[PDB]
Amino acid sequence: AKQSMKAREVKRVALADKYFAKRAELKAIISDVNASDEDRWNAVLKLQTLPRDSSPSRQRNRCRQTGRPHGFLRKFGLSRIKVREAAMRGEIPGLKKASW
Amino acid sequence: MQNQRIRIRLKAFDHRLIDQATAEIVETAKRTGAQVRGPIPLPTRKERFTVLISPHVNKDARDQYEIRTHLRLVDIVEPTEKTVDALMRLDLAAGVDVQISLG
Amino acid sequence: GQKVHPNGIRLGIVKPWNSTWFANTKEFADNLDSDFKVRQYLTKELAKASVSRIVIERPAKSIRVTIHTARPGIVIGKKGEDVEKLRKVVADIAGVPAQINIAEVRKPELDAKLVADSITSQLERRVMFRRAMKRAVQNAMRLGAKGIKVEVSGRLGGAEIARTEWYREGRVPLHTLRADIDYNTSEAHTTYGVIGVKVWIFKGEILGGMAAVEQPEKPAAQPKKQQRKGRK
Amino acid sequence: PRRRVIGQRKILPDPKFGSELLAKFVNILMVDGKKSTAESIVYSALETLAQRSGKSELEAFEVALENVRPTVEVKSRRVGGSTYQVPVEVRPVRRNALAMRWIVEAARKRGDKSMALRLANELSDAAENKGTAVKKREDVHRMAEANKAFAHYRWLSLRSFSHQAGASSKQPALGYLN
Amino acid sequence: ARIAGINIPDHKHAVIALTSIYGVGKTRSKAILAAAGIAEDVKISELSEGQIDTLRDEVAKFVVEGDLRREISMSIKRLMDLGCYRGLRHRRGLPVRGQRTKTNARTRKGPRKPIKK
Amino acid sequence: AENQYYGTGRRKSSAARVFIKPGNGKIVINQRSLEQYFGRETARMVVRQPLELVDMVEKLDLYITVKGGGISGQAGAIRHGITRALMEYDESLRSELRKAGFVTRDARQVERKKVGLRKARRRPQFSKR
Amino acid sequence: PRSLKKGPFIDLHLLKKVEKAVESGDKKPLRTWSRRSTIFPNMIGLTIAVHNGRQHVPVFVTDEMVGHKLGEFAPTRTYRGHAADKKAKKK
RNA sequence: AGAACCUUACCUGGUCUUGACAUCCACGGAAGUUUUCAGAGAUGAGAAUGUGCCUUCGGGAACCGUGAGACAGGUGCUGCAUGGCUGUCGUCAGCUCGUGUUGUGAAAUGUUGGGUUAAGUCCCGCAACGAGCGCAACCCUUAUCCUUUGUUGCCAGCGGUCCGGCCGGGAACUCAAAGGAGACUGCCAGUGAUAAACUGGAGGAAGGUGGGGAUGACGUCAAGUCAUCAUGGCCCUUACGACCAGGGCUACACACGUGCUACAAUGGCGCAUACAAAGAGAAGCGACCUCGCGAGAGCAAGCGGACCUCAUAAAGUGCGUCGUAGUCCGGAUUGGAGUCUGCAACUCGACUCCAUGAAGUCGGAAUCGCUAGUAAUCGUGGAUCAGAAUGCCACGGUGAAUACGU
């Protein structure tokens, strides 16, 4: 359900590439432990203001083929409902029902 | 501790699919080389999924799905790469991938 | 109207499926979406003829499509250009060098989805749906299969209210877990709204599908019964 | 209910014993699932009884396990008329397990410095017919020995039975005619 | 011997015995026992009072509760003139740091009261 | 068995491999002493417990390998692996020890958890209104 | 209780807005949406007006307020008390 | 099933309408990458690298901004307008499909009785006859045991040797995954109406349709989802779309469902001491490395997981200890420090650790699951998975009472 979160995610991967690539460990290099006596100063602590949407921490995905409100499953690119649906029709390979 | 001469892995999604695909690789390995190792079974892998049986509600029964991932050794006593090129090429049955390497 | 989960919880335990490929780890998702896409786009291209089963397969270094039809050579075209085009798009979607072979299923001239086409027409045109499901089952049992179940739903006959109805015949077990057996869910709309048929068809309880392998893979085809094993 | 009679299963032995009366004593002494402690709890108790008297290690154990132990039980049944009871004779297996259960509940709250002292003293106390479950054995057997004078819905059952072939006496029944 | 706290035993090992004698838990009690040369394997009830006096003396340097709980008084008092909301919840005892409060709550958030289910 | 008579002793998913011969009475476990592998454990008094019965703590010699399970289950397994192996005085020895209970294996097998529950078989409770 | 990632920073987003204002000695409400921010020496003496998701609430920034992220001083949410109901009549 | 914003419905604030996305026309910037800065971020300006792709170099695709239609999009309403899909009775022990018959018929009969059962299974028998469904079966798995492979598995004797399969070497052996064998309520005895079959009996790894799992009929219930998804009638399309930030479900008054771990001592503590199974890791985890109170940190050989790592697995075991005293159980709160994905952890997130220290004595009405690898209880991994678990899911440690009776 609901296209706006699916719309957000599709824009995001080109915006990951554009903002975040040049500014991945830059947080760490300029501020944190990699800034060992170098940087840590104001004249360099203005450089990362473009990436905020681009960040992997907002790259939630959900169901990669329709969208779904939570309950995503990363190994299929699918969800609870949509896995069962694809299995009924035999579209998924290697698929047992558990018995041992 | 007797070691191997070459390193080979056969990878498949169910129990019929590994036995047929292996039995065919072991056949190619005799048909293009003299010196052959029969396959060791190795600990097969099993992935656990739980999903709901229905679109909404209930808790009493739900659903559990399994996918097994099957590993065969094969290998060859001779370390001859030409046999491994042929091995991985002529394996186009039951949708198994064999992964090659040297050492 | 409990509707037990009619095939999903029954597979891979000597019951073949409409995909056979190997993946694991985190890339299983990238291979499955790609497999959905090739299933959706490829059967649309060979839609010129009716089609009875679809099998897409990924062994070492190749992608192999098996397709099953009511007559062979029919989706393969004339010359060979038609089938090189089918292999162009299978490679394009999966991203691996492509193969296709033509093959037919057991009882080819009958299939789950061609019964539901037959039942749908009467309903699409808003006339003669009160004996149509029964004549569909009769024809269906004259062309093959050891038993058939049909369930029809819709705003049926063009009615201003909903109806469930069904028709069952012969031997169609429902806890069965051995041999492939053929299933289709139709969905379609016409002027008054949506109709649908759930068509289960049952060929055989050991006829059709794979069989259980009758050996270990461990003794067979082995020209040298050792590497060393301490015996040299 | 029940389509068939179903008996007890096989129970496995424990790494310190091959005797049954010992293995069944450690078993219902089991809590948290961990028998491998209970092995010791039985053998540390039995040595303390054995210091109290040296003729046996079993002195207080064997008669406590007789004395706090029932013989009969009463169920309550009524679907019409008036309230009645039906006594039943039960199996040795459950007579024994009520008795051992009651010994291990009573001894663990007895509050002495070792579980070994607590059990040897609570078997020593019930052996002499003055412990904590002597009262429980005496009340429960009194009620089952007494309600043998009653039967499920007696007043209609006394006409109903003699019409459908049966006796003219007064007898207990398992929720049916008499 | 017991004298102080909620987990000091009588006739059990030394490791535990310093851990509610105020200002010292397990980590320091390991270093203290070593420093006097005392084993991490004697029961404290077996000692002279003057080995307990040597141990106690090495506890007594670290912050006792009397001064800890004054730091927590001044902590709430500083925070409430800010209105730092985390701090307003810390005062009342409201599980705020990463927790739910709709739970079985009575000891912190108040007893049973007349409200609908 | 073409060097030593052999017992398998698999109990509770642990297996005691036990190779028996005549000897000076000793035990070797895991290419070591009972003190190395089972140092400071009740498990050592268990593994002598079948050898005391057949009066073979001093004249049966033994070589022992054990993997799987946990501390009690290996002790239990070696108790079955010795009595299994003991065939080489009489062909009825292993028959009779089984009759006495030492080859007798418990009635427990593998079982898989089921879904829709909180445990192997243990459905959720209901108390709703 | 919670340290603010492993090494030192300042918060880059609040720095460019504040730095130019602390030079002017401004104490006027600074229109801020960027609430994922910390308090630092450069930030004392300012008044940072903090969007809550309905409107900005002014937080007077001072020397006593170090050890905190912005937004907690001004309402994060309302409470639940001990006596209320919606249910009533009015005609 | 992993909810800071995102998520995501909700709410408020910026900002635009072909629009995050496809094709089709028009304009500015190549996208990609490196890099300073303003503003909240959207977005933009400047620097430096590149001007690729196809071609009428008309012009456009790619990403991004701009604009127009056709058109895209819609957790848009209506679940007596619907499709797909599923929960219930219940493992009820019955239901249905074709057809005859008895009654004027509605409809029964079968599909109901007795005895027996997972069973429409089986003895007896009436109008039910023939057949399917539930159930039985094929099925995967275990159990010994046969059987083959012989590493990334193993080691009785033998070598290098600290006595570790690490390696010369060996195949007795588990051992992994698979052909399967064996066990059929078949036998004997009791029970049972002769009888199905239940129980007992025995050898054996193992007997109750061997142990486990798969496994659930027609279908009323106007049952629940238009919110995976399909979809008409039918509404917006400068929006019931869409880009960006922040706030909230997870508040706290309590009640309520479920589960977790405690209240003990079958346990905790101190010291000393032991053995797993299984599985996850191609933007990832990961030996060594230097740093770290610990968790972790950045670097990296390595990896494809029977090879490398999570991992010291814990409870349990050895000894001593403890007396109902909130303790020798429990350790919440809180001060205060250290960490993770990311500009950014404050309220809404997770983990480590230092000091102090409360609630809780097995909980009332109510109430369920369970027949044995179960139940109970302790750790483990995994699905999920940006970041993290008390749960779930599956595993392995230690592993129970009883099943008369309705």
Swiss-Prot record, chain A:
Keywords: Ribonucleoprotein, Ribosomal protein. It comes from the Bacteria. One of its GO terms (biological process) is cytoplasmic translation. InterPro entries: Ribosomal_uS14 (IPR001209), Ribosomal_uS14_bac/plastid (IPR023036), Ribosomal_uS14_CS (IPR018271). Part of the 30S ribosomal subunit. Contacts proteins S3 and S10. Belongs to the universal ribosomal protein uS14 family. This is Small ribosomal subunit protein uS14. It comes from Escherichia coli (strain K12). The gene is rpsN.
UniProtKB/Swiss-Prot annotation, chain B:
Involved in the binding of tRNA to the ribosomes. Part of the processive rRNA transcription and antitermination complex (rrnTAC). The complex forms an RNA-chaperone ring around the RNA exit tunnel of RNA polymerase (RNAP). It supports rapid transcription and antitermination of rRNA operons, cotranscriptional rRNA folding, and annealing of distal rRNA regions to allow correct ribosome biogenesis. In complex with NusB is involved in the regulation of ribosomal RNA (rRNA) biosynthesis by transcriptional antitermination. One of its GO terms (molecular function) is transcription antitermination factor activity, RNA binding. GO terms for cellular component: cytoplasm; cytosol; cytosolic small ribosomal subunit; small ribosomal subunit; transcription elongation factor complex. This is Small ribosomal subunit protein uS10. Part of the 30S ribosomal subunit. Can also form a heterodimer with the transcription antitermination protein NusB. Binding of S10 to NusB is mutually exclusive with its incorporation into the ribosome. The rRNA transcription and antitermination complex (rrnTAC) consists of RNAP, NusA, NusB, NusE (this protein), NusG, SubB, ribosomal protein S4, DNA and precursor rRNA; S4 is more flexible than other subunits. The keyword Metal-binding does not apply. It comes from the Bacteria. Coiled coil: none annotated. Belongs to the universal ribosomal protein uS10 family.
Swiss-Prot record, chain D:
GO terms for biological process: cytoplasmic translation; negative regulation of translation; ribosomal small subunit assembly; translation. GO terms for cellular component: cytoplasm; cytosol; cytosolic small ribosomal subunit; membrane; ribosome. It comes from the Bacteria. The keyword Cell inner membrane does not apply. Changing residue 35 to A/E: Defective in ribosome assembly. Keywords: Ribonucleoprotein, Ribosomal protein, RNA-binding, rRNA-binding, tRNA-binding. One of its GO terms (molecular function) is structural constituent of ribosome. One of the primary rRNA binding proteins, it binds directly to 16S rRNA where it nucleates assembly of the head domain of the 30S subunit. Is located at the subunit interface close to the decoding center, where it has been shown to contact mRNA. Has been shown to contact tRNA in both the P and E sites; it probably blocks exit of the E site tRNA. Part of the 30S ribosomal subunit. Contacts proteins S9 and S11. Cross-links to IF3 and the P and E site tRNAs. Belongs to the universal ribosomal protein uS7 family. The strain K12 sequence is shown. This is Small ribosomal subunit protein uS7. It comes from Escherichia coli (strain K12). The lineage of its organism: Bacteria, Pseudomonadati, Pseudomonadota, Gammaproteobacteria, Enterobacterales.
Swiss-Prot record, chain G:
It holds the Pfam family Ribosomal_S19. Keywords: Ribonucleoprotein, Ribosomal protein, RNA-binding, rRNA-binding, tRNA-binding. GO terms for biological process: cytoplasmic translation; ribosomal small subunit assembly. GO terms for cellular component: cytoplasm; cytosol; cytosolic small ribosomal subunit. It comes from the Bacteria. One of its GO terms (molecular function) is tRNA binding. InterPro entries: Ribosomal_uS19, Ribosomal_uS19_bac-type, Ribosomal_uS19_CS, Ribosomal_uS19_SF. Part of the 30S ribosomal subunit. Binds S13 and L5 and cross-links to the A site tRNA. Belongs to the universal ribosomal protein uS19 family. HAMAP family: Ribosomal_uS19 (MF_00531). PANTHER family: RIBOSOMAL PROTEIN S19P FAMILY MEMBER (PTHR11880), SMALL RIBOSOMAL SUBUNIT PROTEIN US19M (PTHR11880:SF8). In the E.coli 70S ribosome in the initiation state it has been modeled to contact the 23S rRNA of the 50S subunit forming part of bridge B1a; this bridge is broken in the model with bound EF-G. The 23S rRNA contact site in bridge B1a is modeled to differ in different ribosomal states, contacting alternately S13 or S19. In the 3.5 angstroms resolved ribosome structures the contacts between L5, S13 and S19 bridge B1b are different, confirming the dynamic nature of this interaction. Bridge B1a is not visible in the crystallized ribosomes due to 23S rRNA disorder. Protein S19 forms a complex with S13 that binds strongly to the 16S ribosomal RNA. Contacts the A site tRNA. The gene is rpsS.
